[model samples]
Target chain A: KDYDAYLSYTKVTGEEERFALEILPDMLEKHYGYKLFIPDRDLIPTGTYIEDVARCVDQSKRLIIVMTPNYVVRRGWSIFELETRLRNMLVTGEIKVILIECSELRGIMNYQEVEALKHTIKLLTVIKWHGPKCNKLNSKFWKRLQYEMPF
Target chain B: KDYDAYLSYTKVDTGEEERFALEILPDMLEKHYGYKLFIPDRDLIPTGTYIEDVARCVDQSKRLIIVMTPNYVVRRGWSIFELETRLRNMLVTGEIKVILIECSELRGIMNYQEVEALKHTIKLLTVIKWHGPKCNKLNSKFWKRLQYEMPF
Candidate 1:
């Protein structure tokens, strides 16, 4: 019960990706009242990578992977986190992994680009973010988040 | 007791759209979400004017999802037939939510004659367009919008 959802995303550089990382967790907490464990904002710096990641994964009921094209390409801590989540999914079958696609990573995995990811892609719930100024309070993007992380 | 959702899509000419509608959408709704979706290919028998079957399915469902591609509005026969029936249902009940997914840019639909129902529908329809490949994933934008629109 430490957090209802764990916010996981590729380490960011661009404004849009960074904005999503910053805005999404904040909005999920503020608007929907979901207790999110965002690593940068929530994690205490003292814990080891394995201990910390595992601990967060164990405590949370849902794992939200904020995926992008580079997510698979860079292949570091993010991949490890994804694998960890997959392993958890195999064991419990209770925790749901929600993949929130913030970038141009087509059809989730770009199956043509990555073969190993296909298996991982199937087990998750994906949400695509279409950014525009015209987006209203009742936008599909926010509506989806509410549906997955319901109050 | 019939079904919570009814899925509508034009003739799926390609593998991508077909897989998305027939395979991906249904699996997520039925398996993960535990909601009953009436897809004609999977649900009905191989008889009757396509209109009648569509009408019946629309009547039985609480929500209707129109998967509009570029060509969807061009096939004026059964497409309009189904839309008109849903329109009638809307006039009578104003209860069935017609959720639109722009699988492709349905540009031809704006002034087409076969789309009498869509003429009325265009004003108020809540459309969720498929921008690109990102919309295709099970955990992605498309399903999330669908899950929100569902009766469940």
Candidate 2:
């Protein structure tokens, strides 16, 4: 695997983008020495969209999904990223998913594809973000997230 | 497999209930087409755990036809269980084919996780739209399309 974890998130909101681009890399890469594949910064599009995402997920040990309302509804690519990781988790059991609830999600049950994510959320412990408070080094959120990260 | 299809639905709304359990399924798929379907209210015995019964029926059925609606997602127990079971099976074995029938536009507020899960299903599967009693006509496009997916 080229990276310890593959980061999946929708870039519709600045808050989520900042967390995925800045906060995650700073804490996981700069401090903990874990390599992350953040698509916005790290993805090099050599193949088709699906091929690229499938390759990225295949080369990563774990999948970290920054869950938000936008992640569910916005881009098709984000959904593909999620499904690819989930399929790997189901087929091989080699990929573990870590969900970080970035915002309070509210919406109608419009898409059936979300069922896989609902199933995964029940199986794993989801870490919640409490705004700027979680940005502190001593925050429990960070500690729990770090514990869930691959060593 | 004892049945050709397992019908997964929620009886919260009279419209969806009557359509799935009474009108469309019985008339079009069962009576006319002769495909055995395991409908919970129709086929399940009232003895053991519903979870076990559901799993047993799902394992015995060759395919799963999920009737999607706002009520179905909101009820959130057996329907979700059936869906997840079939979904995992589809991903792992590639034997049991899963189909979706959109009874109505999915509406109603839910948790983000639940929303995400349903979205995944919609993206992965092709949804056959149900346009009401009109689809009961044998030559209708809806029935034709749905029948094409059936194993029998």
Candidate 3:
């Protein structure tokens, strides 16, 4: 395992991407000293897309899912990453999953990937992002998230 | 496998047990289709650990047929354990299939984690909704679909 956690989120809307790329690293890596594998920031684009993602997931100890409405509907590499982590969690029981609820996951439960995400959320507690309220270093969101991160 | 399907249902005071035991198991699945089913209440002995026995029964069966109701979804005991085991096995091997029978309305709130997982799992599967004892006739789509999912 190369990193403490692999961050999975939809970069289509850019809102989630900003949080995953900017805010996540600021708090986790800078503050708590945990190395996170964000695909956009860290993924070395060389081999097939599937091969690259599979390698990253395997190299990471935990999978951090940044859940959003776009994440539920999108059916691209994001789904592949999510399902791969889910299968690993169920089969190996070694991969821990941490969900960050960026938005309410209602009305978009029709997608199979959403169902998979919902199942994972049920098993673990989600660290909710309430915008500016959670910007402070002593905010409960960051504290709770840090608690779930690998030491 | 010893049995075609393992019938997992809640045996709470509700009508779920009766519907599964009388109509679903004996009349519809067993007698009509000639399928060997592992019904815990009728098949299991009192001597062994409940979880172990359930796991073994699930292993010996080709498919898992869950009778989903308000009670079944809320139950956190052996029923859920059986379902989780079957689901994990289904995911790992892809050999075992799950068939859900919507015996009643699932209008109740999903307060528990396992219940929420069950709801999500149900959404992915093609559920056979039981109309009533009258709809258990040979020509009905319910029996036809149920038979189609069965191994033999």
Candidate 4:
């Protein structure tokens, strides 16, 4: 029952994504006993830009990468945040990374960031919230891994 | 194949008993193209006797125990040699007591030195070496762990 900590990095950086990130701390505390630290919504505009990711990286012990086609290609802010966390881990060696790839198109192989900063950070695992017919988080599929794994 | 490391320990104190331990060594090596270290024969004897006791404990990689009764137990100087390896390992962990235990039979329980000295550090896993009908090389299905194909 000792869920130590949580950090979320929503690469989309939209007003909708901010709203989604803002709701996590409350729900996570209710089910699993972990304190979620979300970056300030004021860092990014209502529906536009955020350049200073180092601001959030200083407060986090872990980084969660939310990967989508648009976010994978256009997201420099998340990469900067990941780089900061990676630097901290290199200095201290205690950081966990979780990659949430909600990819509509395809692999990060087509992206530059995936190849460039590939070894700089720790990615604990990649969880997919795939398509409509894909049982990405569903409880039953003949080929599915045990859902109760640290998910 | 992990099928090889069949290193066993029998209580042999020179004289007639040397062949009991020696006979099996060359056969196991020749048949399988393998090498096994008799615990008593290593440069440094380790601290442990049982397979589980030695597997990774402190060096005597793994050894099968073959206990001889009181007739041969007093003369089991070969096992004493095995205990020396285990004793050296005990020295590393600051554990002082190290020696093999003779098997506990319906006739009588054995291992007089550890009992007398109160040093329970030797990896004493006892088994009967006598040719009794119930003689099991080991209680484990370890013999069935053989690798080569058997032609019936």
Candidate 5:
């Protein structure tokens, strides 16, 4: 069986990086009953990197990007990953992309439109980290997040 | 969901600092925060170009934590490139949080001036100092300060 979410990122916050890899997956699995694909923990050594990446991602239901202002500027490959996938999804409609905004990356909610190069394409979902207000287990943001996830 | 943070570090010429970063320090955070943190060792997903892989990782990350040390300062590699690119990405991408974790007492190093310039420009950047005897225990006071700076 494949996974439910493919977690993506360029490790910038040493703490945040720890949270994503070592903490979040476990929490999601425990609280939401979700299975996530984190490459370092999940990828096996038996196949080509590209082929395996494609296989795992295709198998997952959603591709989530933990977006920050610095992330896109820092890693060109990560930019390519989201852009290429979004381009494909527009045509294929096979999977969804989720951009999870941190506490600092505010405004720019109409992101895809502002960043549009040609077409006005957009991600299937965007969740802004509203700090304590939206951090509750029963909050709308969490509810929506759970609802959107393929658990 | 988006990851909570992204851990970015250069391989120290000695490797000990990196070992602490890729595992020990992160382990402590994970135990405390119970949040999603993206570590790049697991960042690659096969693409036609490595650029695509880097882009995907950066696009997904919410925070960029650079483990800056004397060794990191001197090296010219992916670490420096990612740091520069992340700085540029912020103008359009909103305030992506950038945390600089210092390995030792801060003196001055190459590109420290560049960081100085960005501090003047960006408001979301924070610098964290890592201190203690080498290989600080998770229970040390130093670890607590480091944890306090990050979102749990």
Candidate 6:
């Protein structure tokens, strides 16, 4: 199956986190051997600022989110980015996740926000609350790479 | 029309801490038009462990659950007694918390005594420890989703 998707993350992400973020597109390209259409930075602004990230995240098969502390806290509009990607999933069956290591963060997306996402997603996956450090991100997040593809 | 599912909770939850666990299942139910299931105790388990209340609660629904709480330190075994009646359902599905709510000391499945006694469903909901006032983390605000009528 060809799992077409995109990866989005923070701009000032440090070296280890950068390496973590950097390998993501390649891992998807290599592991699932998916043929993704992720455009360059000029294509989608940093931290998913581009209108194109929404478009790219929408039309793609999945949104492999790299949820960093900065991705959640520092970015003023980061929650909006989560909102956009989730809307795509809610309406289009797009999947989303935190494909990186992190400490646990929870209690986000209040009842209203969840109700806001009812139309598209089936059940929300526990990504952020689950630290990728609990398992290695590159260590075949096979369970997360669900859904079918032709490739 | 009616919720596709429902739950009646014991009021030992905290919104600030266990918000994530309490929110997901019910939220998903609202989204998918499915329903969440909860156990109702007729009264606080004081003397005889409210066995009749637990029994009545189990009889009313197909699923049986033990919402974990710090109060669960040991007395929650009373919940286990309610569960033993439906021990058969564990095979059909993980009949415990296909949807979960957090209260005192719950960690969902692992905390269950004989976990295999549960049906095979995954931890459908993840509840947290409440560290604030009231069980604010447990109710749906508009009063649109419950499958049962509340006592108080």
The C-alpha lDDT values of all candidates are 0.58, 0.63, 0.60, 0.36, 0.55, 0.39
Candidate DockQ scores, in order: 0.01, 0.04, 0.02, 0.00, 0.01, 0.01
**Candidate 4 docking category?**
incorrect
lDDT string, candidate 2, B1-152, tens digits: 79988887766426644566455665678888889999887887644244456667877887777776555544442233423455445434555566777665555322234434544544335568776767766778987898888886
- What is the Cα-based lDDT of residue B152 in candidate 2? 67
lDDT by residue (tens digit), candidate 1, A1-151: 6788887765624655654566777677876788888877876644244446667866887877766545534322222322334344533555566766555644422332222332334346777765643134668887877888734
Q: Model 1 Cα displacement at B22 (Å)? A: 2.6
TM-scores of the models, in the order given: 0.42, 0.49, 0.45, 0.31, 0.42, 0.34
- Which residue segments of model 1 deviate by more than 4 Å? A1-151, B48-50, B77-93, B108-119, B122-124
Give per-residue CA lDDT, model 3, range A1-151, as digits (tens): 7999888776554555577657877888888888888887876554244446667777887778777655544422233322344455534555677777766655421233344434533335567786656767878888888888777
Clashing pairs in 1: A107-B133, A125-B139, A126-B139, A126-B140, A127-B139, A127-B140, A127-B141, A128-B141
A31-134 in candidate 5: lDDT tens per residue? 88888888667866342444455677778888776654444434312222223343355335566766666536333322322233112224457677544455
lDDT of 5: 0.55
Number of the candidate with higher lDDT, 1 or 4: 1
Which portion of correct inter-chain contacts appears in model 6?
0.00
DockQ-based CAPRI category assigned to the predicted complex of candidate 3 = incorrect
Model 4 gets an lDDT of 0.36
- What's the TM-score of chain B for every model shown? 0.74, 0.76, 0.75, 0.33, 0.71, 0.35
- Name every residue pair that clashes in candidate 4: B45-B85, B46-B85, B46-B86, B47-B86
- Chain A TM-score for predicted structure 2: 0.78
Please report how far candidate 6 places residue B101 from its true position, in Å: 41
Question: TM-score: which is higher, 3 or 4?
Answer: 3
lDDT of candidate 2 over A1-151, digit per residue (tens): 7989888876546666677658877888888889989887886544244456667877887778776655655432233323445454534555667778776654223233343444444435578886767878868988898889877
Worst 10 residues of 5 chain A by lDDT: A109-118
Q: Which stretches of candidate 3 lie over 4 Å from their true place?
A: A13-17, A75-86, A108-115, A120-123, B1-152
